[PDB]
Design an enzyme around this catalytic site. Structure first.
Site, PDB file in Angstrom:
ATOM      1  N   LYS A  10      -8.227   2.617  -7.078  1.00 26.08           N
ATOM      2  CA  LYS A  10      -7.475   1.938  -8.130  1.00 26.08           C
ATOM      3  C   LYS A  10      -7.824   0.467  -8.037  1.00 26.08           C
ATOM      4  CE  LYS A  10      -3.304   2.186  -5.267  1.00 26.08           C
ATOM      5  NZ  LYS A  10      -2.166   3.160  -5.102  1.00 26.08           N
TER       6      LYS A  10
ATOM      7  N   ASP B 120      -7.845   7.668  -3.485  1.00 25.63           N
ATOM      8  CA  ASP B 120      -6.868   6.925  -4.283  1.00 25.63           C
ATOM      9  C   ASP B 120      -7.412   5.625  -4.808  1.00 25.63           C
ATOM     10  OD1 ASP B 120      -4.288   6.617  -5.500  1.00 25.63           O
ATOM     11  OD2 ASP B 120      -3.589   5.425  -3.819  1.00 25.63           O
TER      12      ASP B 120
ATOM     13  N   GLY C  84       1.994   1.406   3.707  1.00 27.05           N
ATOM     14  CA  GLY C  84       2.653   0.285   4.350  1.00 27.05           C
ATOM     15  C   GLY C  84       2.395  -1.029   3.638  1.00 27.05           C
TER      16      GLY C  84
ATOM     17  N   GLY D  68       0.816  -1.200   0.000  1.00 27.84           N
ATOM     18  CA  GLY D  68       0.000   0.000   0.000  1.00 27.84           C
ATOM     19  C   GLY D  68       0.854   1.256   0.000  1.00 27.84           C
ATOM     20  N   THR D  69       0.234   2.404  -0.253  1.00 28.79           N
ATOM     21  CA  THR D  69       0.964   3.667  -0.284  1.00 28.79           C
ATOM     22  C   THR D  69       1.296   4.180   1.114  1.00 28.79           C
ATOM     23  OG1 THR D  69      -1.185   4.770  -0.582  1.00 28.79           O
ATOM     24  CG2 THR D  69       0.187   4.458  -2.544  1.00 28.79           C
TER      25      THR D  69
ATOM     26  N   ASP E  41      -8.382   0.514   1.554  1.00 27.83           N
ATOM     27  CA  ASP E  41      -7.405   1.597   1.520  1.00 27.83           C
ATOM     28  C   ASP E  41      -7.970   2.989   1.320  1.00 27.83           C
ATOM     29  OD1 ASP E  41      -5.316   3.306   1.154  1.00 27.83           O
ATOM     30  OD2 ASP E  41      -4.354   2.123  -0.436  1.00 27.83           O
TER      31      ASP E  41
ATOM     32  N   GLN F  17      -6.196  -2.194  -7.669  1.00 22.98           N
ATOM     33  CA  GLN F  17      -5.519  -2.892  -6.584  1.00 22.98           C
ATOM     34  C   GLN F  17      -6.191  -2.722  -5.227  1.00 22.98           C
ATOM     35  OE1 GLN F  17      -1.828  -0.960  -7.799  1.00 22.98           O
ATOM     36  NE2 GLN F  17      -0.778  -2.936  -7.609  1.00 22.98           N
TER      37      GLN F  17
ATOM     38  N   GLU G 183     -11.038  -7.168   7.552  1.00 24.42           N
ATOM     39  CA  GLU G 183     -11.630  -8.434   7.171  1.00 24.42           C
ATOM     40  C   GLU G 183     -10.870  -8.786   5.891  1.00 24.42           C
ATOM     41  OE1 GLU G 183     -15.344  -8.408   5.048  1.00 24.42           O
ATOM     42  OE2 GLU G 183     -15.377  -6.236   4.962  1.00 24.42           O
TER      43      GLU G 183
HETATM   44  N1  X6B Z   1      -8.892  -6.565   3.230  1.00 25.86           N
HETATM   45  C1  X6B Z   1      -8.041  -6.917   2.357  1.00 25.86           C
HETATM   46  N2  X6B Z   1      -8.073  -8.183   1.797  1.00 25.86           N
HETATM   47  C2  X6B Z   1      -7.099  -8.319   0.923  1.00 25.86           C
HETATM   48  N3  X6B Z   1      -6.956  -9.453   0.289  1.00 25.86           N
HETATM   49  C3  X6B Z   1      -6.404  -9.681  -0.872  1.00 25.86           C
HETATM   50  C4  X6B Z   1      -6.288 -11.043  -1.275  1.00 25.86           C
HETATM   51  C5  X6B Z   1      -5.706 -11.384  -2.520  1.00 25.86           C
HETATM   52  C6  X6B Z   1      -5.232 -10.364  -3.385  1.00 25.86           C
HETATM   53  S1  X6B Z   1      -4.520 -10.809  -4.947  1.00 25.86           S
HETATM   54  N4  X6B Z   1      -3.201  -9.823  -5.289  1.00 25.86           N
HETATM   55  O1  X6B Z   1      -5.519 -10.610  -5.946  1.00 25.86           O
HETATM   56  O2  X6B Z   1      -4.135 -12.216  -4.908  1.00 25.86           O
HETATM   57  C7  X6B Z   1      -5.331  -8.998  -3.012  1.00 25.86           C
HETATM   58  C8  X6B Z   1      -5.913  -8.649  -1.762  1.00 25.86           C
HETATM   59  S2  X6B Z   1      -6.087  -6.925   0.721  1.00 25.86           S
HETATM   60  C9  X6B Z   1      -7.028  -6.078   1.901  1.00 25.86           C
HETATM   61  C10 X6B Z   1      -6.779  -4.776   2.295  1.00 25.86           C
HETATM   62  O3  X6B Z   1      -7.489  -4.221   3.134  1.00 25.86           O
HETATM   63  N5  X6B Z   1      -5.690  -4.121   1.715  1.00 25.86           N
HETATM   64  C11 X6B Z   1      -5.263  -2.838   1.968  1.00 25.86           C
HETATM   65  C12 X6B Z   1      -4.607  -2.124   0.926  1.00 25.86           C
HETATM   66  C13 X6B Z   1      -4.134  -0.795   1.150  1.00 25.86           C
HETATM   67  C14 X6B Z   1      -4.324  -0.177   2.422  1.00 25.86           C
HETATM   68  C15 X6B Z   1      -4.980  -0.881   3.466  1.00 25.86           C
HETATM   69  F1  X6B Z   1      -5.157  -0.308   4.649  1.00 25.86           F
HETATM   70  C16 X6B Z   1      -5.446  -2.206   3.246  1.00 25.86           C
END
Ligand code: X6B
Length: 294
Positions: free
Chosen positions: A125, A123, A16, A13-14, A141, A127, A77
């Site tokens: 996106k 932000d 951490g 993430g941007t 995020d 991702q 979650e």
């Molecule tokens: N809640 C949550 N779940 C996630 N799972 C996940 C599982 C597989 C893939 S993948 N590349 O498709 O295999 C991608 C994500 S990521 C995330 C989250 O909350 N990220 C986050 C990001 C930025 C800032 C922040 F605070 C939290």
């Protein structure tokens, strides 16, 4: 760190790194983000707090917040996959239109909710748009540019994506409105439909000029006040606007009319998430389940 067993690193993430982890006590699998240092501005906890109390089906739930030694941990979650991976996995055939519509509709509900609670994502996106096997898609995020800051990269020399940045941000406006999230979502909608980033810029000026080349260089007629913006230069090239028919084929006309309203230059003319939800494009909206390869 101890009550949790870092299963795998999920991303950068941007602010951490995000890890997939298990609660050695409750056995629950979660997403744990380690925040990037010299005291941890309390002012942000407020922002964070409002977040935990935010509850909507299209917003990733923040389960726990842990502040300890310049280290801030956010426990979310865990969702199954992100939209970037899903789009890549769907590149040969494309995401079926009913699912694109479902996802857009749901994200607009998420934004309408955040925006009514005066929260800005800032932000959006692929991702940070997360999906599950049941057909839901959630906003993850929430930037936190005011709750933290926008230095130079994500945290450790990493190319920040500018592809979804609203023009007013690129032109130096210090104060964004909810309209910046609608712009970003519009860019994402286009991308889902065409299977190619709408504005893949590699620098702020390249990002701005790709927008100009497609939508036309804005002027005082379409965007009152634009020539007085911080980074506006009378010396910007003057490009004519291209037809949406060429920008996003084969999106039907309803989809294109909605997209055009999400991509209006003037933040004040740009459609709101609430109004977008009433657009005719969603008349036949349903909730298909995606084929996810986990
Ligand atoms: N809640 C949550 N779940 C996630 N799972 C996940 C599982 C597989 C893939 S993948 N590349 O498709 O295999 C991608 C994500 S990521 C995330 C989250 O909350 N990220 C986050 C990001 C930025 C800032 C922040 F605070 C939290």
């Amino acid at each position: 760190m101890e009550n949790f067993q870092k299963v795998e690193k999920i991303g950068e993430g941007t602010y951490g790194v995000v890890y997939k982890a298990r609660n050695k006590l409750t056995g629950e699998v979660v997403a744990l983000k380690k925040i990037r240092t010299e005291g941890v501005p309390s002012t942000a906890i407020r922002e964070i707090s409002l977040l935990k109390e935010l509850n909507h089906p299209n917003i990733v739930k923040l389960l726990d917040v842990i502040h300890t030694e310049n280290k801030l941990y956010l426990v979310f979650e865990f969702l199954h996959q992100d939209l970037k991976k899903f789009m890549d996995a769907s590149a040969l055939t494309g995401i079926p239109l009913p699912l694109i519509k479902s996802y857009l509709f749901q994200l607009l509900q998420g934004l309408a909710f955040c925006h009514s609670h005066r929260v800005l994502h800032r932000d959006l996106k692929p991702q940070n748009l997360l999906i599950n096997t049941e057909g839901a898609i959630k906003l993850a995020d929430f930037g936190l540019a005011r709750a933290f800051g926008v230095p130079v990269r994500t945290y450790t020399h990493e190319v920040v994506t500018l592809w979804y940045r609203a023009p007013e941000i690129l032109l130096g406006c210090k104060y964004y409105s909810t309209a910046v999230d609608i712009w970003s979502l519009g860019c994402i909608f286009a991308e889902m439909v065409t299977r190619r980033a709408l504005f893949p810029g590699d620098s702020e000026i390249d990002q701005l000029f790709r927008i100009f080349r497609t939508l036309g260089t804005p002027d005082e007629v379409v965007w009152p006040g634009v020539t007085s913006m911080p980074d506006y230069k009378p010396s910007f090239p003057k490009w004519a606007r291209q037809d949406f028919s060429k920008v996003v084929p084969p999106l039907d006309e309803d989809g294109r009319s909605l997209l055009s309203q999400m991509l209006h230059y003037d933040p004040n003319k740009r459609i709101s998430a609430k109004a977008a939800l009433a657009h005719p494009f969603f008349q036949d909206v349903t909730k298909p389940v995606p084929h996810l390869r986990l």
